[PDB]
Ligand binder design. Structure first.
Ligand SMILES: O=C(O)CCS(=O)(=O)O
Length: 231
């Protein structure tokens, strides 16, 4: 059976109110990730015990230490625009992941191919090269602290979701590599989340696929339906 699912979100006061009042009637880890400036309020306000707060993109020893001290134990790293806009390479992302794990963080590590990479049939090579870089900086025990988020760059914010077949093919390819390079025990416990134009309507169908363990989506009222779709 699948490991514990995750639903992560990547008028905020009304939004925190809505989440706080939501009964979630199954086992799922919910995560709200936000920029430094909003962390303090999110932690002050978000009290639902099935939710944790996550930082994003911290890459400095002292910054990570400060976050942990403040009670932040999760972090999202390597998200799409980090790579295609800011210029974080596969190795920079991998180093940030290694540092975070070393500082005691649960890490949602993001990987995914661009439109051209997809169209030219290079999804597998790109995505696997990205995760291999991450794996290079980790030891086996570290994977207990890692969560993989697969997001086709062409599906992020474009309104174009991957089909269930596309998502499943990508997740299975990732899990098979983890199984063979890291170990089948690690593969079986690893959460691989899908992200990119997930909504209330399409999430539950995606979750039905063998290798989908949850979602990364925007912080919006419909995230509640995304949480419900994780079963
Ligand atoms: O933040 C992401 O990872 C996904 C945002 S969206 O594609 O659902 O609009």
């Amino acid at each position: 059976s699948k490991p514990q699912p995750i639903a992560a979100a990547n008028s905020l006061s009304e939004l925190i109110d809505l989440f706080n009042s939501t009964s979630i009637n199954h086992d799922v880890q919910c995560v709200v990730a936000s920029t430094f400036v909003h962390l303090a309020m999110t932690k002050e306000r978000l009290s639902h015990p099935k939710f944790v707060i996550a930082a994003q993109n911290a890459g400095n020893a002292d910054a990570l230490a400060s976050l942990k001290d403040f009670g932040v134990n999760w972090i999202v790293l390597g998200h799409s625009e980090r790579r295609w806009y800011y210029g974080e390479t596969n190795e920079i992302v991998a180093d940030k992941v290694a540092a975070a794990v070393a500082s005691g963080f649960m890490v949602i590590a993001c990987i995914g191919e661009t439109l051209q990479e997809r169209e030219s049939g290079r999804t597998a090579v790109v995505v696997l090269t990205q995760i291999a870089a991450i794996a290079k900086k980790l030891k086996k025990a570290d994977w207990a602290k890692v969560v993989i988020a697969y997001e086709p760059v062409w599906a992020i914010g474009t309104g174009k979701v991957a089909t269930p077949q596309q998502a499943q093919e990508a997740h299975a390819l990732i899990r098979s590599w983890v199984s063979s390079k890291i170990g089948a025990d690690v593969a079986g416990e690893l959460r691989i989340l899908y992200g990119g134009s997930v909504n209330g309507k399409n999430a539950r169908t995606l979750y039905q696929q063998r290798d989908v363990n949850g979602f990364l989506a925007g912080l919006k009222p419909e995230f509640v339906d995304i949480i419900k779709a994780t079963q």
